[PDB]
Amino acid sequence: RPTVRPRNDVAHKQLSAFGEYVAEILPKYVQQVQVSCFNELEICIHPDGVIPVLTFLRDHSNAQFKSLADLTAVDIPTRQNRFEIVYNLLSLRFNSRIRVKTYTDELTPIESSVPVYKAANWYEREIWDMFGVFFANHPDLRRILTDYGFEGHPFRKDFPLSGYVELRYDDEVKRVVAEPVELAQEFRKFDLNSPWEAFPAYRQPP
C-alpha cells in the first residue's frame, strides 16, 4: 500500500529474541524490554546497572555495541523520578542499534559512563547543564552550553522558554549587564490539541 510504511517482521523477531537474551543474562538490572512497531529495541534498567549493562553490551561477543550514538535525558515532571536517561548504542558488527533507558530524580546521582565510552564525556556535561542530573565520577563535570554563572537547567519542563534574565550593554557601567526579562511582545501560547481522540490503539484504561 503506497502511503503506508511496510512492516519488517524479520527485524522485529530478531530484536525481540535479543531483548529476551539481554534480559536473561542481566536480570539483576533489567526491568522492561520492549520493541516498537518500527523495530527499535529498548532496554529499561535500574540505574545501578548502567555500568554493567553498558559494559556487557559493548564487550559481549553477541552484542559488540562499540559506538555510543547519543546520550540524552527527558524530563517528565509527573514521574517521581522525572529524568529519563537514554543511551542509544550502535553495533557495527551486527549492523544493529539498541536503546538503554534508566531514570533518576533531582538529587540522586547516576554513574558516569565515561569508563565504557569516551564519547559520554560531553553528553553527560550537557545533561548536567540542561537538566541538572549529576554524574558521579565524571572526569570534569561542569556546564558546556549555557553562559557562565547561568542559573537553572533550561531543558526542564518548568523552566520558562525565555528564561529569567536577559542581557544588554549599559553605558553607565560600561559593560554588558543582566536584568529580569521583559518582552515587548509576549510569546503567544496556543492551545492546539483537538478534543477528539486520534489514536484508539494507545487509549489508556479509565
CA distance 40 to 12: 8
Smallest separation, CB 42 to other proteins (Å): 21
Q: Rounded to the nearest whole angstrom, what is the least distance from the CB of residue 19 to other proteins in the complex?
A: 27
Question: Counting contacts by CB under 8 A, is residue 95 touching other proteins?
Answer: no
CB 146, min distance to other proteins, A? 10
Q: Establish if 10 lies at the interface with other proteins (CB under 8 A).
A: no
Q: Are 139 and 121 in contact (CB under 8 A)?
A: yes
Q: Which CB, 9 or 158, lies closer to other proteins? A: 158
Burial level of 134, CB count in 10 A (0-12/13-18/19+)? middle
The correct pick among 37, 61, 95, 189 for binding other proteins (CB under 8 A) is: 189
Between 24 and 172, whose beta carbon lies closer to other proteins?
Answer: 172
Binding segment toward other proteins, per CB under 8 A, in 27-35, 52-60, 115-123, 150-158: 150-158
If you search the block for the grid coordinates 570534569, which residue do you land on?
A: 140
Those residues whose C-beta lies under 8 Å from the C-beta of residue 83, and which sit 6 or more positions away, are: 73, 74, 75, 76, 103, 104, 105, 106, 131, 133
Residues sharing a CB contact under 8 Å with residue 10, sequence separation 6 or more, in sequence order: none
Cell numbers at 162, concatenated? 525565555
Helix (H, G, I), strand (E, B) or coil at 178: strand
Binding mask 111-130 for other proteins (x = CB under 8 A): --------------------
> Does residue number 80 form part of the binding site for other proteins (CB under 8 A)?
yes
Contact 145, 126 (CB under 8 A): yes
Nearer to other proteins, 99 or 156 (CB): 156
Q: Which residues bind other proteins (CB under 8 A)?
A: 2-3, 77-80, 106-109, 132, 134, 136, 141-143, 147-153, 157-164, 170, 172-173, 175-198, 200, 203-206
